[PDB]
Amino acid sequence: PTIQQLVRKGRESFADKSKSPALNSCPQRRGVCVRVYTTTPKPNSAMRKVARVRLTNSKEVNAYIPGEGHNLQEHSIVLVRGGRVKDLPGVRYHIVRGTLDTAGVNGRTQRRSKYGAKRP
Amino acid sequence: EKRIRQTNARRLHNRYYARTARNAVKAFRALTDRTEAEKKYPVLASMLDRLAGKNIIHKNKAANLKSKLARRINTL
Amino acid sequence: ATKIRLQRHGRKGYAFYKIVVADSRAPRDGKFIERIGSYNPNTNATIDLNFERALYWIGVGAQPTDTARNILSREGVLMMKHLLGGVKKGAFDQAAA
Amino acid sequence: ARYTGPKSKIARKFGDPIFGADKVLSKKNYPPGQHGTSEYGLQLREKQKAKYTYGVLEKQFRHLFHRAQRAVTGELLIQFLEARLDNVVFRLGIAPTRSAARQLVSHRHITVDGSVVNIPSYSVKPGQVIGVRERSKSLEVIADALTGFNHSKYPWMEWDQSSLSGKLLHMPDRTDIPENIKEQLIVELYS
């Protein structure tokens, strides 16, 4: 545009959206397991364990449960962090293992800190 | 309690003299006779100056009142 | 009143004081009118001082604290008694001792 | 922290004898592991070679690098690495290897300008005296490394055996320091 056009109007800059809006600019939130169910991936064909959780920030979302073997159930207090799964539409949050009701993965000897397992 | 009592006593003391001076200026403001104004001015000026130097009112306030009353009596 | 005092401008365990001219109502390390020197009690005590400005402020009537008064007693700032023209016109030299 | 691990593995990884002479330098000389390269690989090898041969960790190495950049950058980084208390003690021959020099400096055995300095990373400026402690001039281990060996092959150390002190004349140029390190690779990696 011309210099006078820029003087009259100016330039407008948008705002980048946050990839985890339900956290409300927090690292982790606390919730209760409203529902525990299983979903199918959008060329994978697995059975991924998910929980619908109502967070304390007045919001309900879906959180994936990483690892093999979950002791969670309905109406369980869990810690929810960011991070999405590529081959699953919907879910965009993870459940921290080893915190609150969620227990660490049993029989883990590698990648222990990502699944909350102590040194054996 | 001491502060409350001191403030009440000092408030009454200040109110006494401030109201007396205000009534004096109000009474002087209805005068008509030049000789009466001349013989009533010095006691009122003395009372106002005593108030000002006594810190019930301000020196500039007393100066303004004295100037107003003198300029009034200079024109009957 | 206007004072001559020291603000603690240093590190924990190492006190370094700034000699300033400031109002008595100001905070200890806050606002000041003029900086007139430094002070370090850790050495064996190095003192920086603006002689002319310290004389000017002690002449216009800034009241120094006890430690600042001792600092002004050193470096011969309290020579206003000799500079008051006490039935004389020459200037003595006591700095050599 | 410190490496305090196996040294022959690093020696066989890098090929060069950074720590000194060993039989494994000529017998079974190959990178370690039962299973044993891009320019990133060679640059990383060079940087790790410098770090392992001088006993410096990553944060200290980066601080040294950008200090040299602030004040050829790769040329004077090498002399900055050489100007260290443990390295200078080792080059004076009073201690056998650089790890031994580091331990000697860390313990109360080495003085700088008559005052004991036990930080084994203290930069030594030119025209300074580094000497053994007067209370530790009669140790069984302290004498065989200096006396007898008597290399004195560096034209920037003055030894003065009659006082057991030593002096650094000036920072040696990049050609006179016997270290097989390509500083261009490291400055390119960190650039």
Partner: protein
């Protein structure tokens, strides 16, 4: 040996009010962002003891104490009609 007060040279924009006038001061200044030179105008209120100023006049005004709610300037000279 006094201090100096602010002086503004301008053009009379209104005189319909008694004993006071409005002065327009216009100047060209550089835009902060794009660097172009744009025109700006400001309006002052001035005190004139006589309604002797018509619409449009190069005049000078000087800063004063508050003489009214919005009146801080006084007339000093008339450059031209």
């Amino acid at each position: 040996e006094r201090n100096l007060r602010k002086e503004r040279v301008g053009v009379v924009s209104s005189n319909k009010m008694d004993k006071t006038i409005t002065v327009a001061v216009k100047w060209k200044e550089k835009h902060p962002i794009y660097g172009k030179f744009v025109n700006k105008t400001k309006k002052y209120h001035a005190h004139d003891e006589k309604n002797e100023c018509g619409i449009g006049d190069t005049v000078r005004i000087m800063e004063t104490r508050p003489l009214s709610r919005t009146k801080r300037w006084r007339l000093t000279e008339i450059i031209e009609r």
